[PDB]
Structure 1
Amino acid sequence: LAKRIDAALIMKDGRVVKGSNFENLRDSGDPVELGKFYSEIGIDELSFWDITASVEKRKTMLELVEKVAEQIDIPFTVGGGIHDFETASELILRGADKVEINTAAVENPSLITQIAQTFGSQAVVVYIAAKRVDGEFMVFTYSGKKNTGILLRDWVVEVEKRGAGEIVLGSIDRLGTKSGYDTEMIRFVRPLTTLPIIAHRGAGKMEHFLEAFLAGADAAKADSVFHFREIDVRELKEYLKKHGVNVRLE
């Protein structure tokens, strides 16, 4: 299939955390308006990641999904502390196409299967945050705070076995950096799974997307490099097409 370009939007109390540099927008911190704009300039799928600390979180995420679904016509994922089936189910029913789970899946891998039983594997995205520790790739949970001691190699295989649809491979070794995706990590995981692999963390320039696809990623996700306009999405797609990557153009 075509390689996919995804934008992730970090959200808190209904606002895009740190906003965006698109002066054309009425509200460059409105996740709905920013997502719509991305969907019109060539992003293929959107991820919305909520860090609303608790009490209002569940209603906030539901209202976000509802507003996004009304306005955008490309697939989107919602994530951020989805811990059980009923939470996932209400978000999908309210409009999300996929849910993106990490810590709760590691703690109870049957959650992957439970969501997929009702909504299909394609509705379940597992975000794997991994880091090198003593020469092994290890899985981390709780926003990078906890080394689970679970090997990336074992967790990728289990995630597919449990019925996930896609894996987002986030390199903690690239968090905050702009040096490139962790192509070694992507190459490590590629032979272990038939699932789509979505690279995350490390992108700083268009060439980094080419590198990630050469490494075997099926999609590449980024956030601040788009929001602060270090990379233009349309230029990126034109660049990838020029160098032989199958991406969707308009």
Structure 2
Amino acid sequence: ALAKRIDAALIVKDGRVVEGSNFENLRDSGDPVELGKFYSEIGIDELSFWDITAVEKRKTMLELVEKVAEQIDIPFTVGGGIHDFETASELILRGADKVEINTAAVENPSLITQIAQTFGSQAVVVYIAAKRVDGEFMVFTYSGTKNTGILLRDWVVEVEKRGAGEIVLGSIDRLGTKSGYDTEMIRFVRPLTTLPIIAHRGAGKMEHFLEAFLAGADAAKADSVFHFREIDVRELKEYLKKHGVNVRL
């Protein structure tokens, strides 16, 4: 098999973890590099960093990927406000395994192609934020707030065609919610693409992850459930492996 992956997402701003973590065993529980590193040691397969720095942003983001590339041994993705090829190229550049684009991809899909052909499809992740609108899955930009009018089913196909290597599927309705991943959305998207699917939004308990993997997800991304210690990563992996999921352990 293919191993299923568990991803920790970190939101960062000015080199800090926005809202920190409860890993007080750490020297600075709000340091993304030390927190990233610590997750890699306890059983997280990949890391994700989303930057919301002010402009200050480029230097901040470059310093982040430099310090992470040097310290951590697992794959990592860096996003966003990465609006052009040059910024993307430079971050990959500086040590990021992948760049994640969302609003930029929708507004410039050719941006997927450009990074893909210079660095390979494996270097490009497109975050799709989607929401049911009148019985239809629609793609949304600007953190889930702007209805683009594009069907999920069409963007998924287009994203693939342009050469993305992987897709985050984030259920806007589940933002903040704790009651499971949107497995019906996962199951909708699964037969449309052979790209890897990373589920995002909704995780509350270990069983949620088993459900998303049944749904066809190749990876499951979570953040605050991990940071706040609601779910222990080791315990999550031992639970998945006990119920037949092919996880890293």
| TM-score, normalised by the number of residues in structure 1 | 0.99
How much does 1:207 deviate?
0.2
Residue 17 (1) aligns with residue 18 (2): yes
How much does 1:13 deviate?
1.1
Whole-Å separation in 2 of the counterparts to 1:65 and 1:108: 24
Q: What is residue 47 of structure 1 aligned with on the other side?
A: 48
Q: What is residue 32 of structure 2 aligned with on the other side?
A: 31
How much does 1:72 deviate?
0.1
- Across the aligned residues of Structure 1 and Structure 2, the Cα RMSD in angstroms comes to 0.4
How much does 1:23 deviate?
1.1
How much does 1:50 deviate?
0.2
User: Could you list the per-position Cα deviations for residues 69-107 of structure 1 after superposition, in whole angstroms to 9, with x for gaps in the alignment?
Assistant: 110010000001110100100000101000000111111
Whole-Å separation in 2 of the counterparts to 1:172 and 1:143: 9
User: Could you list the per-position Cα deviations for residues 151-208 of structure 1 after superposition, in whole angstroms to 9, with x for gaps in the alignment?
Assistant: 0000000000000000000000100000000000000000000000000000000000
Q: What is residue 214 of structure 1 aligned with on the other side?
A: 214
Whole-Å separation in 2 of the counterparts to 1:80 and 1:164: 16
Runs of 4 or more off by more than 2 Å in structure 1?
Answer: none
Whole-Å separation in 1 of the counterparts to 2:232 and 2:188: 29
Whole-Å separation in 1 of the counterparts to 2:23 and 2:107: 39
- 3-state DSSP of counterpart to 1:47: strand
- 3-state DSSP of counterpart to 2:56: helix
How much does 1:143 deviate?
0.9
Whole-Å separation in 1 of the counterparts to 2:222 and 2:212: 12
| TM-score, normalised by the number of residues in structure 2 | 0.99
User: Could you list the per-position Cα deviations for residues 133-160 of structure 1 after superposition, in whole angstroms to 9, with x for gaps in the alignment?
Assistant: 0110000001112100000000000000
Whole-Å separation in 1 of the counterparts to 2:155 and 2:196: 15
Unpaired segments ≥5 residues, structure 1: none
User: Could you list the per-position Cα deviations for residues 110-135 of structure 1 after superposition, in whole angstroms to 9, with x for gaps in the alignment?
Assistant: 10010001100000000000000011
Taking every aligned residue pair, what percent have the same amino acid on both sides? Answer: 99
> What is the number of residues matched between the two proteins?
248
Whole-Å separation in 2 of the counterparts to 1:12 and 1:108: 24
Whole-Å separation in 1 of the counterparts to 2:117 and 2:80: 21
